[PDB]
């Protein structure tokens, strides 16, 4: 594998050979190759002590078509918006005509 390096602190903090490797050996942790200096600079003190809209909720439309699922959400969001607008217009007209009829009677 490229851009990888296998290393374990159990063989590095004990200061043994074979503490790093590039191949898949059982018991080693794979880290990145460019961050091995960041691994060596992290364990410095241990070595020093050793030395010293409300549409498409993705719950209903799961067993549906995966192809046209972008426009289907848009159509649902448009329908919800239209249903909200028709409700708002009805609520506005209900407090306008009846209010005028109350002013007339």
């Amino acid at each position: 594998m490229r851009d990888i390096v296998f290393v374990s602190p159990q063989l590095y903090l004990s200061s043994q050979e074979g503490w790093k490797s590039d191949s898949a050996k059982s018991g080693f942790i794979p880290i990145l190759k460019n961050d091995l200096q960041r691994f060596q600079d992290s364990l410095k003190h241990i070595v020093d002590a050793r030395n010293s809209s409300t549409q498409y909720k993705v719950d209903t439309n799961t067993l549906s078509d995966l192809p046209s699922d972008a426009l289907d959400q848009l159509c649902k969001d448009i329908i919800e918006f239209r249903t909200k607008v028709v409700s708002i217009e009805k609520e506005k007209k209900m407090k306008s005509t009846y209010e005028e009829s109350r002013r007339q009677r």
């Binding site: 290393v7 602190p9 880290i31």
Partner: peptide, 19 residues
């Protein structure tokens, strides 16, 4: 996945304290 910033930090936190 290699060039991501979070993967290197998580990998170094794993390899920093293995247990």
């Amino acid at each position: 996945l290699i060039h991501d910033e979070n993967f290197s930090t998580l990998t170094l936190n794993v390899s920093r304290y293995p247990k």
